[PDB]
Amino acid sequence: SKKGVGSTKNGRDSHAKRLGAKKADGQMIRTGQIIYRQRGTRVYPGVNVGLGSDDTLFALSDGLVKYQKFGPKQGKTRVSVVKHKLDA
């Protein structure tokens, strides 16, 4: 005897968006490359770093990326692109 079985009601899931950090600290970067994909600003933008229509951080100039912790109780993260600054 099988006795019959009930039915499940929740078996739905969405595609996983590949968010997170893309360029790590110290890595050289050119303008227009993505540094951080997020839903809502988890990492604030600094100098030479822009914002998009999806809160995506992209570079604005050549240089080395660099994360600096700031904000109350050092709970806010900020990214920047320190220009090559070779300066001979």
Binding site: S1, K2, K3, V5, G6, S7, T8, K9
Partner: protein
């Protein structure tokens, strides 16, 4: 039968009883206590049996505290049912007892009755119990 009045989620993942003792490790309300030596899942039915045992073997002025509480529920699929078609329905509530958690404590009656009372409470529970006293 101790039972939470409401829960946000009917069917939670079971909580492991393997490990040392997180909280409820030292007698802090009474001065004699029933410590556990083997982590296990014990349900509200065993608590009520043990609590009723303590109360029947207590006196007219003894006072007791129950530390553990059956927060987590557990489910059980109905009999003769093949695997699939979702999780079963919640059946009984169990308190998670780890190795070293003081379950029951007693005070305000002589030592022999308290030792005897904790013994009858621990014979009602699956865990391997042990008597401990409160630090001065």
């Amino acid at each position: 039968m101790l039972q939470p009045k409401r829960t946000k989620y009917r069917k939670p993942h079971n909580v492991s009883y393997e490990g040392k003792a997180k909280g409820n490790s030292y007698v802090a309300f009474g001065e004699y206590g029933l410590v556990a030596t083997k982590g296990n899942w014990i349900d509200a039915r065993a608590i009520e049996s043990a609590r009723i045992a303590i109360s029947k073997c207590l006196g007219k002025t003894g006072k007791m505290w129950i530390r553990i509480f059956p927060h987590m529920s557990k489910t059980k699929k109905p009999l003769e049912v093949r695997m699939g078609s979702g999780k079963g329905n919640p059946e009984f509530w169990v308190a998670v007892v780890k190795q070293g958690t003081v379950m029951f404590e007693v005070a305000n009656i002589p030592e022999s009755q308290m030792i005897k009372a904790l013994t009858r409470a621990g014979h009602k529970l699956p865990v391997t119990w042990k008597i401990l006293k409160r630090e001065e």
